[PDB]
Amino acid sequence: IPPISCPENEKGPFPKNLVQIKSNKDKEGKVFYSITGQGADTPPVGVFIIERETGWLKVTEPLDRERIATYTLFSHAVSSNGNAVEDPMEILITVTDQNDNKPEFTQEVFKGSVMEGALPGTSVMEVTATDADDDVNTYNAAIAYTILSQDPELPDKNMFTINRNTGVISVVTTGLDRESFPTYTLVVQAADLQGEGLSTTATAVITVTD
Amino acid sequence: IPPISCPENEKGPFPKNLVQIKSNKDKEGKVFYSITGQGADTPPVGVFIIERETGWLKVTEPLDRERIATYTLFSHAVSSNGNAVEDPMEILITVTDQNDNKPEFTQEVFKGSVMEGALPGTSVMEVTATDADDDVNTYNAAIAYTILSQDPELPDKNMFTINRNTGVISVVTTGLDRESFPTYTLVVQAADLQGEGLSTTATAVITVTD
Ligand SMILES: CC[C@H](C)[C@H](NC(=O)C[C@@H]1NC(=O)[C@H](CNC(=O)[C@@H](N)CC(=O)O)N(Cc2ccccc2)C1=O)C(=O)NC(C)(C)C
Numbered sequence A, B: 001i002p003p004i005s006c007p008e009n010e011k012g013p014f015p016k017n018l019v020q021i022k023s024n025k026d027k028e029g030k031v032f033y034s035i036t037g038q039g040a041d042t043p044p045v046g047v048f049i050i051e052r053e054t055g056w057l058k059v060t061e062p063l064d065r066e067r068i069a070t071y072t073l074f075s076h077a078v079s080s081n082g083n084a085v086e087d088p089m090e091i092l093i094t095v096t097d098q099n100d101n102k103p104e105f106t107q108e109v110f111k112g113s114v115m116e117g118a119l120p121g122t123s124v125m126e127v128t129a130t131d132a133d134d135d136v137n138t139y140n141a142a143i144a145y146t147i148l149s150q151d152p153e154l155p156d157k158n159m160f161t162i163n164r165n166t167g168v169i170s171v172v173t174t175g176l177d178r179e180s181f182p183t184y185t186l187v188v189q190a191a192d193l194q195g196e197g198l199s200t201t202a203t204a205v206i207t208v209t210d
């Protein structure tokens, strides 16, 4: 019985049927089913159960892929006279991802510096966010960066730009002047689903140098 | 075969193995597998394929639960001499949800009115959004309403509140007067994951009457 697959964060009610395990050797007589493993009889206990009589395997609560992503259980079958009628059968349960984590910036405030008269197209600094969701299988961790605001808006509103992919911030125009406008405070955003998804912001403060 | 489950919006590469179908007639000799159904040989065509010889059921592109959430296919098995060696076996494929739809308000502009006598706690009007994601199994369509802004901001900034579950808007404070301010324009928001998720905005326009 190949990998069972359950999404994290499912609504109730619980418990919920996954799949029905059965033994050939029951047409002889009555069979009792049980499970072992982490998730069953070792911690966390009781997340998966199995009906002793019917062999229905159930999940009893919501799962969390970022806490546990896979479970390995073993299925047991015992005759009514008390003997195992099978070797224990391995069961694999795979927990599939929901986009339940916002991107998080590695800092609240990133700090950088830029020289007056820096060529337009000069890289200044890099901001960085991570996302705890599943980046191999989904777009739930796929981060795009944007700039939301610049303060002050002088001498131009859009002195800087950010590479959507790498989070690298560049100077895009001219007229840096530390004696009139000594810093720039940018609000930066990171959003998963390639920009369309959940979002967080942080701040980048750029000091203008000689 | 219990249901096969595949998440929507999976990354590649494709195609992806789902599960291997087999017959016992393997032993007797060569068998060739095929599938029929909507999703296989009728529209949409070729989303699922089966490997003629190995019996690997595959999916050939990212799925979209909001187009089709459940497929019903039938597997066929045929000897290399060209006779059906089984009855067609039904196969169920469930597409599990990602949160890839924002809520949408039923209108862009909701209208309501409220007598200027109105006591705090008086219901004015109701806004309403839908969400196309899976409202039975997930929270991905679990919408909470909020107010974002009010124009004008007099005689107080927050003349109204909104029930975050039902979207019923109510008077929350005193000092309504048609003569001085006959019209309020609220921006309302609907967000899924019980408020924490994807979001959208509309407008509510409230007229003060005598
Ligand atoms: C995600 C859980 C899903 C929601 C759930 N479905 C299930 O529990 C069945 C579950 N589905 C599967 O596809 C996996 C097979 N494994 C894989 O698909 C990946 N591990 C490999 C991959 O395809 O990437 N199996 C085993 C299997 C499947 C078919 C036939 C024989 C064995 C299942 O038994 C369900 O129906 N939910 C409702 C109630 C319909 C909404």
Ligand SMILES: [Ca+2]
Binding pocket: A008, A063, A064, A065, A066, A067, A100
């Ligand atoms: Ca989680």
Ligand SMILES: [Ca+2]
Binding pocket: A099, A100, A101, A102, A103, A131, A132, A133, A140, A141, A192, A198
């Ligand atoms: Ca995420």
Ligand SMILES: [Ca+2]
Binding pocket: A008, A065, A066, A097, A098, A099, A100, A101, A132, A133, A134
């Ligand atoms: Ca997740």
Ligand SMILES: [Ca+2]
Binding pocket: B008, B063, B064, B065, B066, B067, B100
């Ligand atoms: Ca979709």
Ligand SMILES: [Ca+2]
Binding pocket: B008, B065, B066, B097, B098, B099, B100, B101, B132, B133, B134
């Ligand atoms: Ca969806």
Ligand SMILES: [Ca+2]
Binding pocket: B099, B100, B101, B102, B103, B131, B132, B133, B140, B141, B192, B198
């Ligand atoms: Ca949604």
